[PDB]
Coordinates of C-alpha atoms and ligand atoms in Angstrom, one line a residue:
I1 CA 188.8 72.4 126.9
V2 CA 186.4 74.4 124.6
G3 CA 188.3 77.7 124.7
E4 CA 190.0 76.5 121.6
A5 CA 186.6 76.8 120.0
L6 CA 186.1 80.4 121.1
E7 CA 189.4 81.1 119.4
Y8 CA 188.0 79.5 116.3
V9 CA 185.0 81.8 116.2
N10 CA 187.4 84.7 116.0
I11 CA 189.4 82.9 113.4
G12 CA 186.3 82.1 111.5
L13 CA 185.3 85.8 111.6
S14 CA 188.7 86.7 110.1
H15 CA 188.5 84.0 107.5
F16 CA 185.1 85.3 106.5
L17 CA 186.2 88.9 106.0
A18 CA 188.9 87.7 103.6
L19 CA 186.5 85.8 101.3
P20 CA 186.5 87.3 97.7
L21 CA 184.2 90.3 97.3
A22 CA 182.2 88.1 94.9
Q23 CA 181.5 85.3 97.5
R24 CA 181.0 87.9 100.3
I25 CA 178.3 89.7 98.4
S26 CA 176.3 86.6 97.6
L27 CA 176.6 85.7 101.3
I28 CA 175.1 89.2 102.0
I29 CA 172.3 88.0 99.8
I30 CA 172.0 84.3 100.8
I31 CA 172.0 85.0 104.6
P32 CA 168.9 87.2 104.8
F33 CA 167.1 84.8 102.4
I34 CA 167.6 82.0 104.9
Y35 CA 166.9 83.9 108.0
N36 CA 163.6 85.1 106.5
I37 CA 162.5 81.6 105.7
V38 CA 163.6 80.5 109.2
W39 CA 161.8 83.3 111.0
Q40 CA 158.5 82.6 109.2
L41 CA 158.6 78.9 110.1
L42 CA 159.1 79.9 113.8
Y43 CA 156.4 82.5 113.5
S44 CA 153.8 79.9 112.5
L45 CA 154.5 78.2 115.9
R46 CA 153.2 81.4 117.6
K47 CA 149.4 81.1 118.0
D48 CA 148.6 84.6 119.3
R49 CA 149.5 85.7 115.8
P50 CA 147.2 85.4 112.8
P51 CA 148.6 83.0 110.2
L52 CA 151.2 84.8 108.0
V53 CA 151.2 84.2 104.2
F54 CA 154.5 82.5 103.1
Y55 CA 156.9 84.5 100.9
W56 CA 160.4 84.0 99.4
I57 CA 161.8 87.5 98.8
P58 CA 162.4 89.4 102.1
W59 CA 160.9 92.8 102.5
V60 CA 159.0 92.6 99.2
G61 CA 156.7 90.1 100.7
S62 CA 153.5 89.3 98.8
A63 CA 153.5 92.7 97.1
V64 CA 153.3 91.4 93.5
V65 CA 150.3 89.1 93.7
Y66 CA 148.5 91.5 96.1
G67 CA 149.0 94.3 93.7
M68 CA 147.8 92.4 90.7
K69 CA 144.7 90.6 91.9
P70 CA 144.0 91.5 95.5
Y71 CA 140.5 89.9 95.6
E72 CA 141.9 86.6 94.2
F73 CA 144.7 86.8 96.7
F74 CA 142.3 87.4 99.5
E75 CA 140.2 84.5 98.3
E76 CA 143.0 82.0 98.4
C77 CA 144.2 83.2 101.8
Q78 CA 140.6 83.0 103.0
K79 CA 140.3 79.4 101.9
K80 CA 143.5 78.5 103.8
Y81 CA 143.3 80.5 107.0
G82 CA 139.8 81.9 107.3
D83 CA 139.0 85.6 107.6
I84 CA 142.0 86.8 109.5
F85 CA 145.6 86.5 108.1
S86 CA 148.7 88.6 107.6
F87 CA 151.0 89.2 104.7
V88 CA 154.1 91.2 104.1
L89 CA 153.9 94.2 101.9
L90 CA 157.1 96.2 101.0
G91 CA 158.4 96.3 104.5
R92 CA 155.1 96.3 106.2
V93 CA 153.0 93.5 107.8
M94 CA 149.4 93.8 106.8
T95 CA 146.8 92.0 108.9
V96 CA 143.7 91.4 106.8
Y97 CA 140.3 90.9 108.5
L98 CA 137.8 89.9 105.8
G99 CA 134.0 90.2 106.0
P100 CA 131.5 92.3 108.1
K101 CA 133.4 91.5 111.3
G102 CA 136.5 92.8 109.7
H103 CA 134.6 96.0 108.8
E104 CA 133.6 96.3 112.5
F105 CA 137.1 95.5 113.7
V106 CA 138.8 98.2 111.6
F107 CA 136.3 100.9 110.8
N108 CA 135.0 101.0 114.4
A109 CA 138.3 100.6 116.1
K110 CA 139.3 102.7 119.0
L111 CA 140.9 106.1 118.2
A112 CA 143.8 105.0 120.4
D113 CA 144.2 101.7 118.7
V114 CA 144.7 102.6 115.1
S115 CA 145.7 105.6 113.0
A116 CA 144.6 106.4 109.4
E117 CA 146.8 109.5 109.1
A118 CA 149.8 107.3 110.0
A119 CA 148.8 105.0 107.1
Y120 CA 147.9 107.7 104.6
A121 CA 149.9 110.9 105.2
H122 CA 152.7 110.0 102.7
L123 CA 150.2 109.1 100.0
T124 CA 148.4 112.5 100.3
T125 CA 150.3 115.3 102.1
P126 CA 152.7 115.7 99.1
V127 CA 149.7 116.0 96.8
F128 CA 147.3 118.2 98.8
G129 CA 149.8 120.3 100.9
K130 CA 150.3 120.8 104.6
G131 CA 148.0 121.2 107.6
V132 CA 144.9 119.3 106.2
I133 CA 143.3 115.8 105.9
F134 CA 146.1 113.5 107.0
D135 CA 148.7 116.1 108.0
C136 CA 147.0 117.0 111.2
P137 CA 145.5 115.4 114.3
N138 CA 142.3 113.3 113.8
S139 CA 140.4 116.0 115.7
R140 CA 141.4 118.6 113.1
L141 CA 140.3 116.1 110.4
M142 CA 136.9 115.7 112.1
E143 CA 136.3 119.4 111.9
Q144 CA 137.6 119.8 108.4
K145 CA 135.0 117.1 107.4
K146 CA 132.4 119.2 109.1
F147 CA 133.5 122.4 107.2
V148 CA 133.3 120.6 103.9
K149 CA 130.0 118.9 104.7
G150 CA 128.7 122.4 105.3
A151 CA 128.9 123.1 101.5
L152 CA 127.3 119.7 100.8
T153 CA 123.7 120.4 101.7
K154 CA 120.5 119.6 100.0
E155 CA 120.2 123.3 99.0
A156 CA 123.7 123.3 97.6
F157 CA 122.8 120.2 95.5
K158 CA 119.7 122.0 94.1
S159 CA 122.0 124.8 92.9
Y160 CA 124.7 122.4 91.6
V161 CA 122.4 120.3 89.5
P162 CA 121.8 122.8 86.7
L163 CA 125.5 123.9 86.8
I164 CA 126.6 120.2 86.4
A165 CA 124.0 119.7 83.6
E166 CA 125.4 122.8 81.8
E167 CA 128.9 121.4 81.9
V168 CA 127.8 118.0 80.6
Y169 CA 125.9 119.6 77.6
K170 CA 128.9 121.9 77.1
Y171 CA 131.2 118.9 77.0
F172 CA 128.9 117.1 74.5
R173 CA 128.9 120.3 72.4
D174 CA 132.6 121.3 72.4
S175 CA 134.6 118.2 73.2
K176 CA 136.4 116.6 70.3
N177 CA 135.4 113.3 71.8
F178 CA 131.7 114.1 70.9
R179 CA 130.8 117.3 69.0
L180 CA 127.1 116.3 68.9
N181 CA 126.1 119.3 66.7
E182 CA 128.4 118.0 64.0
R183 CA 128.5 114.2 64.6
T184 CA 125.7 111.7 65.2
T185 CA 128.0 108.7 66.1
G186 CA 131.6 108.2 67.3
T187 CA 134.0 106.2 69.4
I188 CA 135.3 107.4 72.8
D189 CA 137.7 106.0 75.4
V190 CA 135.9 106.3 78.7
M191 CA 139.2 106.6 80.6
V192 CA 139.8 109.8 78.5
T193 CA 136.2 111.3 78.6
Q194 CA 135.2 110.6 82.2
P195 CA 138.2 112.3 84.0
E196 CA 137.5 115.4 81.9
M197 CA 133.8 115.4 82.5
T198 CA 134.4 114.8 86.2
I199 CA 136.9 117.7 86.7
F200 CA 134.7 120.1 84.6
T201 CA 131.5 119.3 86.6
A202 CA 133.3 119.2 90.0
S203 CA 135.2 122.4 89.3
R204 CA 132.2 124.4 88.2
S205 CA 130.1 123.3 91.2
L206 CA 132.5 123.0 94.1
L207 CA 135.1 125.6 93.0
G208 CA 133.0 128.1 91.1
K209 CA 133.0 129.7 87.7
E210 CA 136.4 131.4 87.8
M211 CA 138.2 128.2 88.7
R212 CA 136.3 126.2 86.1
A213 CA 137.3 128.9 83.5
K214 CA 140.9 128.2 84.3
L215 CA 140.7 124.6 83.1
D216 CA 140.1 126.1 79.6
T217 CA 143.7 127.4 79.6
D218 CA 147.3 126.1 79.9
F219 CA 146.7 126.1 83.6
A220 CA 144.8 122.8 83.0
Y221 CA 148.3 121.2 82.5
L222 CA 149.1 121.8 86.2
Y223 CA 146.0 119.8 87.1
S224 CA 147.3 117.0 84.9
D225 CA 150.7 117.3 86.7
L226 CA 149.2 117.3 90.2
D227 CA 146.9 114.4 89.1
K228 CA 149.8 112.3 88.0
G229 CA 151.4 112.9 91.5
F230 CA 148.4 111.0 93.1
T231 CA 149.7 107.5 92.8
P232 CA 150.4 104.4 95.0
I233 CA 154.2 104.9 94.6
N234 CA 153.9 107.7 97.1
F235 CA 153.4 104.9 99.7
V236 CA 157.1 104.0 99.2
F237 CA 158.8 106.8 97.3
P238 CA 156.9 110.0 98.3
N239 CA 159.8 112.2 97.4
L240 CA 162.7 111.5 95.1
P241 CA 164.7 113.9 92.8
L242 CA 162.8 113.2 89.5
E243 CA 160.8 115.2 86.9
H244 CA 157.5 113.6 88.0
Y245 CA 157.9 114.9 91.5
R246 CA 158.8 118.5 90.7
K247 CA 155.9 119.1 88.4
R248 CA 153.7 117.7 91.1
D249 CA 155.1 120.0 93.8
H250 CA 155.1 123.0 91.4
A251 CA 151.4 122.2 90.5
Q252 CA 150.5 122.0 94.2
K253 CA 152.0 125.5 94.8
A254 CA 150.6 126.9 91.6
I255 CA 147.1 125.5 92.2
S256 CA 146.9 126.3 95.9
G257 CA 148.2 129.8 94.9
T258 CA 145.3 130.3 92.6
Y259 CA 142.7 129.3 95.2
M260 CA 144.4 131.7 97.6
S261 CA 144.4 134.5 95.1
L262 CA 140.6 134.0 94.7
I263 CA 140.1 133.7 98.4
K264 CA 142.0 136.9 99.3
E265 CA 140.3 138.8 96.4
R266 CA 136.8 137.7 97.6
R267 CA 137.6 139.0 101.1
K268 CA 139.1 142.2 99.7
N269 CA 135.7 142.8 98.0
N270 CA 133.4 141.6 100.7
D271 CA 132.2 139.3 97.8
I272 CA 131.5 136.3 100.0
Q273 CA 128.2 134.6 99.1
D274 CA 127.0 131.0 99.1
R275 CA 128.0 130.0 95.6
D276 CA 130.6 127.3 96.2
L277 CA 132.9 125.4 98.5
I278 CA 135.2 128.3 98.5
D279 CA 132.6 130.8 99.8
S280 CA 131.6 128.1 102.4
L281 CA 135.1 127.4 103.8
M282 CA 135.7 131.2 103.9
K283 CA 132.7 131.6 106.2
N284 CA 133.1 128.4 108.1
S285 CA 136.6 127.1 108.8
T286 CA 137.3 128.1 112.5
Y287 CA 138.0 125.1 114.7
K288 CA 136.3 124.8 118.1
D289 CA 139.4 125.9 120.0
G290 CA 139.1 129.2 118.1
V291 CA 142.0 128.6 115.7
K292 CA 141.1 129.6 112.1
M293 CA 142.3 127.7 109.1
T294 CA 144.8 129.7 107.1
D295 CA 144.1 130.6 103.5
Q296 CA 146.8 128.1 102.7
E297 CA 145.1 125.3 104.7
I298 CA 141.7 126.2 103.1
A299 CA 143.2 126.0 99.6
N300 CA 145.0 122.7 100.5
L301 CA 141.7 121.3 101.8
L302 CA 140.0 122.2 98.5
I303 CA 142.7 120.3 96.5
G304 CA 142.3 117.2 98.7
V305 CA 138.6 117.2 98.4
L306 CA 138.6 117.8 94.6
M307 CA 141.4 115.2 94.0
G308 CA 139.8 112.4 96.0
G309 CA 136.3 112.9 94.5
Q310 CA 138.0 113.2 91.1
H311 CA 139.4 109.7 91.0
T312 CA 136.5 107.8 92.7
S313 CA 133.8 109.5 90.7
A314 CA 135.7 109.3 87.3
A315 CA 136.3 105.6 87.7
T316 CA 132.7 105.0 88.7
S317 CA 131.1 106.8 85.8
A318 CA 133.5 104.9 83.5
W319 CA 132.4 101.6 84.9
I320 CA 128.7 102.6 84.7
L321 CA 129.2 103.3 80.9
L322 CA 131.1 100.1 80.4
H323 CA 128.5 97.9 82.1
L324 CA 125.6 99.6 80.3
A325 CA 127.5 99.3 77.0
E326 CA 126.6 95.5 76.9
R327 CA 123.2 96.0 78.4
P328 CA 120.9 97.8 75.9
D329 CA 118.0 96.3 78.0
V330 CA 119.2 98.4 81.0
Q331 CA 119.7 101.6 78.9
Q332 CA 116.2 101.1 77.6
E333 CA 114.8 100.6 81.1
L334 CA 116.7 103.7 82.3
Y335 CA 115.5 105.8 79.3
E336 CA 111.8 104.9 80.1
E337 CA 112.4 106.2 83.7
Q338 CA 113.8 109.4 82.4
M339 CA 110.8 109.9 80.1
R340 CA 108.4 109.2 82.9
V341 CA 110.0 111.4 85.6
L342 CA 110.9 114.3 83.3
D343 CA 107.7 114.2 81.3
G344 CA 109.3 113.1 78.0
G345 CA 112.3 115.4 78.6
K346 CA 110.1 118.5 78.9
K347 CA 110.8 119.0 82.7
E348 CA 114.2 120.4 83.6
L349 CA 116.3 118.0 85.7
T350 CA 116.5 119.1 89.3
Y351 CA 117.9 117.6 92.5
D352 CA 114.3 116.7 93.7
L353 CA 113.6 114.9 90.4
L354 CA 116.9 113.0 90.6
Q355 CA 115.6 111.5 93.9
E356 CA 112.6 110.1 91.9
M357 CA 114.9 108.1 89.6
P358 CA 115.3 104.9 91.6
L359 CA 116.6 102.8 88.7
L360 CA 119.3 105.4 87.9
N361 CA 120.4 105.5 91.5
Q362 CA 120.3 101.7 91.6
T363 CA 122.6 101.6 88.7
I364 CA 125.1 103.8 90.5
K365 CA 124.6 101.6 93.6
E366 CA 125.3 98.4 91.7
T367 CA 128.3 99.8 90.0
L368 CA 129.7 100.8 93.4
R369 CA 129.1 97.2 94.5
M370 CA 130.9 95.6 91.6
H371 CA 133.6 98.3 91.5
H372 CA 134.5 99.7 94.9
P373 CA 137.1 102.3 93.9
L374 CA 139.3 101.5 96.9
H375 CA 139.9 97.8 97.2
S376 CA 141.9 98.2 100.5
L377 CA 141.6 100.7 103.3
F378 CA 144.5 100.8 105.9
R379 CA 145.2 101.7 109.5
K380 CA 148.5 101.6 111.3
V381 CA 148.2 99.7 114.6
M382 CA 149.2 101.9 117.5
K383 CA 148.4 99.8 120.5
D384 CA 148.3 96.0 120.7
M385 CA 144.8 94.9 119.7
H386 CA 143.3 91.6 120.7
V387 CA 141.0 90.1 118.1
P388 CA 137.8 89.0 120.0
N389 CA 136.9 85.3 120.1
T390 CA 140.4 84.4 119.1
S391 CA 143.8 84.2 120.8
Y392 CA 145.0 86.6 118.2
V393 CA 146.9 89.7 119.1
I394 CA 147.8 92.3 116.5
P395 CA 151.0 94.0 117.8
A396 CA 151.6 97.8 117.5
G397 CA 153.5 98.7 114.4
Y398 CA 151.4 96.2 112.3
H399 CA 148.8 97.5 109.8
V400 CA 145.2 96.4 109.6
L401 CA 143.6 96.1 106.2
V402 CA 139.9 96.2 105.6
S403 CA 138.3 95.4 102.2
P404 CA 134.5 95.8 101.9
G405 CA 135.0 95.6 98.1
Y406 CA 135.9 92.0 98.5
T407 CA 132.7 91.3 100.4
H408 CA 130.8 93.2 97.7
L409 CA 131.8 90.4 95.4
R410 CA 130.8 87.4 97.6
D411 CA 127.8 85.2 96.6
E412 CA 127.1 84.6 100.3
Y413 CA 126.2 88.3 100.7
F414 CA 125.1 89.1 97.2
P415 CA 123.6 86.2 95.2
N416 CA 125.3 85.9 91.7
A417 CA 127.8 88.6 92.9
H418 CA 129.7 88.7 89.5
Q419 CA 126.4 89.6 87.7
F420 CA 125.5 93.2 87.1
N421 CA 121.9 93.4 88.3
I422 CA 120.5 96.8 89.3
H423 CA 117.3 95.1 90.3
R424 CA 119.0 93.5 93.3
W425 CA 118.4 97.0 94.8
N426 CA 114.6 97.2 94.1
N427 CA 113.0 99.4 96.8
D428 CA 116.5 100.0 98.2
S429 CA 117.9 102.7 95.9
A430 CA 119.4 104.9 98.7
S431 CA 123.1 105.6 98.4
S432 CA 123.4 104.1 101.9
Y433 CA 121.6 104.2 105.3
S434 CA 121.8 103.0 108.9
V435 CA 120.0 99.9 110.2
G436 CA 119.9 101.3 113.8
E437 CA 121.8 103.4 116.3
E438 CA 123.8 106.5 115.2
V439 CA 126.8 108.3 116.5
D440 CA 128.6 111.6 115.7
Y441 CA 132.4 111.9 115.6
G442 CA 132.3 115.6 114.8
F443 CA 130.9 115.9 111.2
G444 CA 127.3 114.7 111.8
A445 CA 125.3 111.7 112.9
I446 CA 126.3 108.6 111.0
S447 CA 125.7 104.8 111.5
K448 CA 127.2 103.4 114.7
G449 CA 127.3 99.9 113.3
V450 CA 129.6 99.2 110.4
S451 CA 128.5 95.6 109.8
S452 CA 126.7 96.0 106.5
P453 CA 128.2 93.8 103.7
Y454 CA 127.8 96.8 101.5
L455 CA 130.1 99.6 102.5
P456 CA 131.2 101.6 99.5
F457 CA 131.7 104.8 101.6
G458 CA 133.4 103.0 104.6
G459 CA 132.3 103.7 108.1
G460 CA 133.3 105.0 111.5
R461 CA 135.2 108.2 112.0
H462 CA 136.9 108.1 108.6
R463 CA 133.6 107.6 106.7
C464 CA 133.2 109.4 103.4
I465 CA 131.3 112.7 103.3
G466 CA 131.1 112.9 99.6
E467 CA 128.5 110.2 98.9
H468 CA 125.7 112.6 98.2
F469 CA 127.9 114.8 96.1
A470 CA 129.0 111.8 94.1
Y471 CA 125.4 110.6 93.5
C472 CA 124.4 114.1 92.5
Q473 CA 127.2 114.4 90.0
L474 CA 126.9 110.8 88.7
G475 CA 123.1 111.2 88.7
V476 CA 123.1 114.3 86.5
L477 CA 125.8 113.0 84.2
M478 CA 124.1 109.6 83.6
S479 CA 120.6 111.1 83.3
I480 CA 122.0 113.3 80.4
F481 CA 124.0 110.4 78.9
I482 CA 120.9 108.2 78.9
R483 CA 118.6 110.9 77.4
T484 CA 121.0 111.9 74.7
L485 CA 122.9 108.8 73.6
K486 CA 122.8 105.1 73.1
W487 CA 126.1 103.2 73.2
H488 CA 127.6 99.8 72.8
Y489 CA 130.9 97.9 72.4
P490 CA 133.2 97.6 69.4
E491 CA 132.8 94.1 68.0
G492 CA 134.0 91.4 70.3
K493 CA 134.7 93.8 73.1
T494 CA 133.3 93.6 76.7
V495 CA 133.8 95.0 80.2
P496 CA 137.5 95.3 80.9
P497 CA 139.1 93.9 84.1
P498 CA 140.0 96.4 86.8
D499 CA 143.5 97.8 87.3
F500 CA 144.1 97.1 90.9
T501 CA 147.6 98.9 90.9
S502 CA 146.2 102.4 90.3
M503 CA 145.1 104.8 93.0
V504 CA 141.5 103.6 92.3
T505 CA 140.2 100.4 90.7
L506 CA 139.7 102.0 87.3
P507 CA 139.1 99.9 84.2
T508 CA 142.1 98.7 82.3
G509 CA 142.2 100.9 79.2
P510 CA 141.7 101.7 76.5
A511 CA 138.1 100.9 77.2
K512 CA 136.3 102.1 74.2
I513 CA 132.5 102.5 73.6
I514 CA 130.6 103.6 70.5
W515 CA 128.0 106.2 71.0
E516 CA 125.1 107.4 68.8
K517 CA 122.6 110.2 69.2
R518 CA 119.1 109.1 70.0
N519 CA 118.0 112.3 68.3
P520 CA 120.5 112.9 65.4
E521 CA 119.1 116.4 64.7
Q522 CA 119.0 117.6 68.3
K523 CA 121.4 120.6 68.6
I524 CA 123.0 121.9 71.7
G525 CA 122.7 125.7 71.9
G526 CA 124.9 128.5 73.2
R527 CA 128.1 130.2 71.9
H528 CA 131.5 128.6 71.4
Ligands
LIG601 C1 155.8 97.1 93.2 C2 155.6 96.1 92.1 C3 154.1 96.1 91.6 C4 153.8 94.9 90.7 C5 153.1 95.2 89.5 O1 153.1 93.9 91.5 N1 153.1 96.2 92.6 N2 153.1 95.4 93.7 C6 152.1 95.8 94.5 N3 151.5 96.9 93.9 C7 150.4 97.6 94.4 C8 149.7 97.2 95.5 C9 148.7 97.9 96.1 C10 148.2 99.1 95.5 N4 147.3 99.9 96.1 C11 146.7 99.5 97.4 C12 146.4 100.8 98.1 N5 145.5 101.6 97.4 C13 144.9 102.7 98.0 C14 144.5 103.8 97.3 C15 144.0 104.9 97.9 C16 143.8 104.9 99.3 O2 143.4 106.1 99.8 C17 143.5 106.4 101.2 C18 142.7 107.6 101.5 C19 141.2 107.3 101.7 O3 140.5 108.5 101.4 C20 141.2 109.1 100.3 C21 140.6 108.6 99.0 N6 139.2 109.0 98.8 C22 138.1 108.7 99.4 N7 137.1 109.4 99.0 C23 137.6 110.1 98.0 N8 138.9 110.0 97.8 C24 141.0 110.6 100.4 C25 140.2 111.1 101.5 C26 139.9 112.4 101.6 C27 140.3 113.3 100.7 F1 140.1 114.6 100.9 C28 141.1 112.9 99.6 C29 141.4 111.6 99.5 F2 142.2 111.2 98.5 C30 142.7 108.7 100.4 C31 144.2 103.9 100.0 C32 144.8 102.8 99.4 C33 145.9 101.9 96.0 C34 146.3 100.6 95.3 C35 148.9 99.5 94.3 C36 149.9 98.8 93.8 C37 152.2 97.2 92.7 O4 152.0 98.1 91.9
LIG602 C1 131.9 106.9 94.4 C2 132.5 107.9 95.1 C3 133.3 107.7 96.4 C4 133.6 106.6 97.1 C5 133.2 105.1 96.7 C6 134.3 107.0 98.2 C7 134.8 106.1 99.2 C8 135.4 106.5 100.4 C9 135.8 105.7 101.4 C10 135.8 104.1 101.4 C11 136.3 106.4 102.4 C12 136.9 105.9 103.8 C13 138.4 105.6 103.6 C14 139.0 104.9 104.9 O1 138.2 104.7 105.8 O2 140.2 104.6 104.9 C15 136.2 107.8 102.1 C16 136.6 108.8 102.8 C17 136.4 110.2 102.5 N1 136.0 110.7 101.3 FE1 135.1 109.5 99.8 N2 134.4 108.3 98.3 C18 133.8 108.8 97.1 C19 133.7 110.1 96.8 C20 134.1 111.2 97.5 C21 133.8 112.6 97.2 C22 133.1 113.1 95.9 C23 134.4 113.4 98.2 C24 134.4 114.9 98.3 C25 133.5 115.7 97.7 C26 135.0 112.5 99.1 C27 135.6 112.9 100.2 C28 136.0 112.1 101.3 C29 136.5 112.5 102.6 C30 136.7 114.0 103.0 C31 136.8 111.3 103.4 C32 137.3 111.2 104.9 C33 138.6 110.5 105.0 C34 138.9 110.3 106.5 O3 138.2 110.8 107.3 O4 139.9 109.6 106.8 N3 134.8 111.2 98.7 N4 135.6 107.8 100.8

């Protein structure tokens, strides 16, 4: 008889429940630890699954090392399993596909196969507000990107360039970090100066003079509040009853409220021109089904667009300054270009003249290669995906992770990849371009192929639409920096390592540089 054993299960269950609440808790710990380790070992037997990176702590997965040095993580994984592999991240299984084929597999994936908004909505909806970007169907996103692109035209850029220049000179004149009319040399932290320069120039151009004027008041503090709410933690803890989160939410309401105030006032004046992104969205934000964006959605879309461009651009100009700080040879070469194109500084900078500064654009290009702001782009897998030329199947509920920034740093695709060399882009200074066929997902014709090893602006339906705005802003900014100042490192200092745990791969601060005026007696005019 074995029925005596079935009794003994029951008995065992009872004897278990009467263990001391000390031993019983550790069992509550030690059991999932063992099952996890067992499940992985069984998972490796499955060959329609990409290799899974081993980990001890359940749920947490490889979060720590991935968070701290994702490119070094990816390299070790790549050496062991090749380009396709999975790892556990805070409850989620990420399947990484490295290299150009990975770009193709994720960026060009079927709309039915993956979802970005499913990956990203928690990160962004709390910050931007409802109804826009990733809080709406992909088809709504496609048209929003079309609306915003409508204020990012060549003629807009011609009008923005002098507005941006004015803000940069204003910042050199009035900021305590510079004060060039009073000081001929000084030390700055680029992680302090660049976010300020960035929001000032982006506000003035995209949002207009009134909105820029508000950053000169206490209202600036709300931007700082909202800004602090744009962080990776939102991936895990989007909302939780703390101080941090209420300021953020308050800020969102307060800032969207201000844009709406301006919007409603411009319409109640028939004062709707072609100045800024606000005018533009007012005139052009009706979807194809005839539904119009609400004033709230318009305001929210403004916040999203300003916030995203804030962090990518601010990090990029910081890195540019940092790399040039140890390359007086490159500052020198850039200065010669400025003198040539602007006739010794006589000519006023314009959008057309910016396009005749290939070395400057190449410098932005090379900084975006060495410092892709977003080291990992995500999609949630919605339908089972088979990985071509493999037996691999990525089951729904997984996430795919693509990382062009990792490929940016591979010697195979960029010789001496960890060397800053703007001349690798000689006669190839364009922000990006297509090597063949194009396609349109609803916001303009863009490259069909996404196989370039250089993809700072992504590709496919979720491709950036800010690239030309960013080059315009970075271009004006760096053209004025170069013409006005030389700079270098404090003794024994050099380019800092990136902080891969922040929203963007900004430098680990404080990252200080020492500036000095090229023309000590040059004064910046205007009232203050
Ligand atoms: C827990 C213990 C801790 C210890 C120390 O290990 N740890 N362990 C692990 N980690 C860890 C691990 C990983 C990370 N992150 C990985 C994910 N990252 C990330 C960032 C942004 C992303 O943005 C998605 C969209 C794309 O478009 C944007 C952006 N944009 C594009 N153009 C302009 N803006 C956009 C678009 C349109 C708009 F209109 C606006 C927008 F914004 C938003 C996607 C991914 C951040 C870093 C951080 C920390 C830890 O910290
Ligand atoms: C150096 C500057 C920038 C870089 C490197 C950059 C990079 C990117 C990348 C990689 C994506 C695709 C994300 C994904 O596929 O998951 C993206 C998307 C996007 N970016 Fe940018 N970006 C920059 C600046 C800007 C600016 C200045 C704006 C607005 C003025 C902007 C607005 C957008 C928008 C609207 C999307 C679409 C997101 C989607 O369709 O899912 N970006 N950007």
